[PDB]
Design a protein around this ligand. Structure first.
Ligand SMILES: [Ca+2]
Length: 299
RNA sequence: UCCCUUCUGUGAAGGG
């Protein structure tokens, strides 16, 4: 029974060659092409080719779900929606300049291991920030602290029938470390609100420039876990009942899911020829589906 | 990115 093997091989290679026609006035987005190139390049004969290709398919299915969601998303209302989410968590981003200055003041207060009550921390920062930023208030600054709180940046030490005492955990006693956990927390709030936001836009939102794209990219990369693919599918699937699904993206669901149940972890077992074929058929289907949606059902 | 108060908040309670 090695004819089955060869025919699986042939069908897989056919799938990849068929998607290769998209390369390349290209219909596909800038990253999607990239992932496609990585997919065309796996040599399926080679075992590193089969496992790589398998995960390249899972990845390409990832980006397909993302892009599809990005259509269903209002670009002008993106930042308003983000900041809306942030304020809904009792947090607030005061803007890049002020936020940087505020975080540094928090650090000025707490890098040497000091423990302060929340009230006193807020007061410290307000008193020192209002001279350069007249806007500053206990309310708004309290919102910045609450953002660091929700980030689990504090060792909080309770005092019976009194205010708690807060210390910066030692791993966060430098501006770099702190600003990373801060920013990462904002990114998470973006994710729980279901918003997709490109690294360039993140650099814009949090820094007022474009020189922080790789940093943000790293944050988004570190937040990535396998389980997200499936629930992102979930998100899209309920976004399609707010639509009635005119383009019938629903037809993609079973392939997307097959792609989702692929294990992307290394040392995960190599695929059988029938898994290789089913996976590459699935990806061929969904990328075609993406292109159909973009070109034929947009605005 | 309405604003401000209060609070021990992975957040609540109220004002303009
Ligand atoms: Ca008391």
């Amino acid at each position: 029974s090695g004819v089955e093997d060869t025919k699986h091989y042939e069908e897989a290679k056919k799938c990849v060659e068929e998607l290769a026609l998209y390369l390349k006035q290209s219909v596909l987005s800038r990253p999607m092409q990239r992932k496609l190139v990585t997919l065309v390049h796996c040599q399926l004969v080679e075992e590193e080719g089969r496992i790589r290709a398998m995960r390249a398919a899972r990845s390409l299915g990832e980006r397909t779900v993302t892009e599809l969601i990005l259509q269903h998303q209002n670009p002008q209302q993106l930042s308003s929606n983000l900041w809306a989410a942030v304020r809904a968590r009792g947090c607030q981003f005061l803007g890049p300049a002020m936020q940087e200055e505020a975080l540094k003041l928090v650090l000025l207060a707490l890098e040497d291991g000091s423990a302060l009550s929340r009230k006193v921390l807020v007061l410290f920062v307000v008193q020192r920030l209002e001279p350069r930023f007249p806007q500053a208030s206990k309310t708004s600054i309290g919102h910045v602290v609450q953002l660091l709180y929700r980030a689990s940046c504090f060792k909080v030490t309770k005092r019976d029938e009194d205010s708690s005492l807060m210390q910066l955990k030692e791993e966060f006693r430098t501006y770099e470390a702190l600003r990373r956990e801060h920013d990462s927390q904002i990114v998470q709030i973006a994710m729980e609100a279901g918003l997709r936001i490109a690294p360039d836009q993140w650099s814009s939102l949090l820094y007022g420039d474009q020189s922080h794209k790789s940093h943000m990219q790293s944050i988004i990369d570190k937040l990535q876990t396998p389980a997200s693919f499936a629930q992102s599918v979930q998100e899209l699937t309920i976004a399609l009942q707010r639509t009635g699904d005119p383009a019938n993206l629903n037809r993609l669901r079973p392939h997307l899911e097959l792609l989702a149940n692929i294990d992307p972890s290394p040392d995960a077992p190599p695929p059988t020829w029938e898994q290789l074929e089913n996976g590459l058929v699935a990806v061929r289907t969904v990328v075609h589906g993406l292109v159909d949606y973009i070109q034929n059902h947009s605005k």
